[PDB]
Symmetry: C3
Subunit: 89 residues, 3 copies
């Protein structure tokens, strides 16, 4: 039940973010998430730099399509399922 | 088993962060998570701005109460359940 | 099935990040995740400070070993399991 619902919810979610604009769950072949830590420094010559942390979720489709998902939506729906709540209301 | 435990753990968690200060699982009606990407820029007039990324988890109760949960606690307990470990020890 | 797979995947993951360099799932006794919000300010004397947000996942082993896991890998594999996809491919 929950895997059906989550897969359909993720497919609905990336359909809005994009072959057709509409994505089906069977097309979902992978998920990649990267967390980039922040960094702040100064070169030996005085140039300051600040790299803000980044969280990126990429969904890969069987046809090679790659589409970003919203990390907040992803975490929200993991928590909803963990609590027995409706996904992607 | 795991949904019971997670719901009770989240209710315990937000009870400490708040009708009574104590929240019950049946009261939990929604969860909202937002991820705000960082941003850095400069206006055309030279004003610099830096917006740090933000991760926010909001739990909604049937009585309209909204209470923030700690994002680290949330992710920790998702991982604990995924590993068969005790939640919210 | 999924708890077996997740536990084995996490053990494989931290084995690469470290008694032996290889970690077994039965050794995994805890997980701790902290989210540190960003902060930006200025002291009353003009010193600026900027603390970037941080997400840290620490796995604890029965022998007291503590090892950091990659937060992106963790979130990725939660999402993979939620979608019925292979973990840690
Ligand atoms: Mg960037
Ligand atoms: Mg803010
Ligand atoms: Mg630091």
């Amino acid at each position: 039940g929950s895997v059906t619902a989550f897969r359909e919810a993720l497919a609905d979610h990336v359909s809005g973010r994009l072959r057709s604009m509409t994505v089906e769950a069977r097309e979902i072949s992978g998920i990649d998430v990267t967390w980039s830590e922040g960094d702040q420094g100064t070169s030996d010559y005085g140039d300051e730099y600040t790299h803000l942390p980044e969280l990126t979720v990429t969904v890969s489709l069987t046809d090679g399509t790659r589409v970003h998902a919203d990390p907040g939506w992803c975490i929200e729906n993991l928590l909803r399922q963990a609590c027995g709540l409706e996904v992607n209301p």
